[PDB]
Amino acid sequence: MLSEQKEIAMQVSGMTCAACAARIEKGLKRMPGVTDANVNLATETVNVIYDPAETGTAAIQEKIEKLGYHVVTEKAEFDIEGMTCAACANRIEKRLNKIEGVANAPVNFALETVTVEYNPKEASVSDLKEAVDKLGYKLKLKGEQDSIEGR
Structure with a gap:
């Protein structure tokens, strides 16, 4: 059906x-x-x-x-290095939306970022990278530290 x-x-x-x-x-x-x-x-x-x-x-x-x-779902912020034609962003939204254990995945056209609101026990960044690699873009983390390097 x-x-x-x-x-x-x-x-x-x-x-x-x-x-x-x-x-x-x-x-x-x-x-x-x-x-x-x-x-x-x-x-x-x-x-x-x-x-x-x-x-x-x-x-x-x-x-x-x-x-x-x-x-146990967190709004992790990521940066995107693929979009341009307001198309990749839309597709990546509709993908990331529900890769497996993603609650939400809103994309921003202001800073070319995606917030991925997902479960880091069920999935992890590597899956996100591998997925977006399959979409044929490259996906970056928004800092993932905020200058927290110590030793």
Whole structure:
């Protein structure tokens, strides 16, 4: 058929790893797009499968948050050395959006940066580099230190 269900696989904390996990998945099953909703509590990874045209990764996280939990997901800033024709940025946004355990990925055309809002346990910079390398651009970190070199 048509439709292209995404998977989002992210780490959530606060789980008792029984009723809590089940409460999340059941609560998320309230949503229409939520085609399936699973929680590999053994590895503390919430994996939710839904259409990106009803629900929205942001609402998924919001529902987890409203359930009284927190996602181990961080807004890491990156710099981009590929865009120009306002096209690569759009594609990279729509990619980075949900590589695996990415909640969000807004791009800036002011400083040619991307904030990647993702789970650094499930994925890591190397994946980002390898992905963008596949898109055929080069991806830089915004400092990744802020002059914190000591010895």
